[PDB]
């Protein structure tokens, strides 16, 4: 089991960490969602699907910088919504193919009432997402750590 980002940066068998740089909607009003869709950014596959079933969870998601300060967060994992920053490990997603499949993660961030101005700074760390991979074959328990960075400022109108 291994994963790669949209630009080809990979985390190999056994886990590790990688940076993900995301474009963000430049203007987000109070009452609206800023969507950070990682399903277009992170892709994974099973290296031995003939025999092994891989189990993949969002073990946890943490918020940083402007996102922690200025937004109220929800994460959708495989279509279901949970608090972000997270409060529990999600249900599993199975990877049973050698063909790359998106990691079905998206953040939905809505400004808090005190938010206004540059709510996310370009280049800043906005989130850390931990992908946990196990299987039905052995005792492997690996973490793939995704450090999410903003490519641009996000302005919340006042
Ligand atoms: C003949 C025996 C061959 C064993 C191959 C094991 C490959 O393991 C990796 C990491 C597992 O954690 C993972 O479950 C597996 C499949 O994605 O890929």
Swiss-Prot record:
Give UniProt keywords alphabetically: Fimbrium, Signal
Biological processes annotated in GO:
cell adhesion; cell adhesion involved in single-species biofilm formation; cell-substrate adhesion; mechanosensory behavior
Provide the primary localization: other
The keyword Cytoplasm belongs to this UniProt entry's keyword annotation? no
Compartments, record wording: Fimbrium
UniProt GO cellular component terms: host cell membrane; pilus; pilus tip
Q: Which domain of life is it from?
A: Bacteria
Q: Name one GO molecular function term.
A: D-mannose binding
Q: Which family does it belong to?
A: Belongs to the fimbrial protein family.
Task performed by this protein? Involved in regulation of length and mediation of adhesion of type 1 fimbriae (but not necessary for the production of fimbriae). Adhesin responsible for the binding to D-mannose. It is laterally positioned at intervals in the structure of the type 1 fimbriae. In order to integrate FimH in the fimbriae FimF and FimG are needed.
Q: What is this protein called?
A: Type 1 fimbrin D-mannose specific adhesin
- Which organism is the protein's source? Escherichia coli (strain K12)
Protein's gene? fimH
- Which section of the whole protein is represented? 22 to 179 of 300
């Amino acid at each position: 089991f291994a994963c790669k980002t949209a630009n080809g940066t990979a985390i190999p068998i056994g886990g590790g960490s990688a940076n993900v740089y995301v474009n963000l909607a430049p203007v987000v009003n109070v009452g609206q969602n800023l969507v950070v869709d990682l399903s277009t950014q992170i892709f994974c596959h099973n290296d031995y699907p003939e025999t092994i079933t891989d189990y993949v969870t969002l073990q946890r998601g943490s918020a940083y910088g402007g996102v922690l300060s200025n937004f109220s967060g929800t994460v959708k994992y495989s279509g279901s919504s949970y608090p972000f920053p997270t409060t529990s490990e999600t249900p599993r997603v199975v990877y049973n193919s050698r063909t790359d499949k998106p990691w079905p993660v998206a953040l939905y961030l809505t400004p808090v009432s005190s938010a206004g101005g540059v709510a996310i700074k370009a280049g800043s760390l906005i989130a850390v997402l931990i992908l946990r991979q196990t299987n039905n074959y052995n005792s492997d328990d690996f973490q793939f750590v995704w450090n999410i960075y903003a490519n641009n400022d996000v302005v919340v109108p006042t």
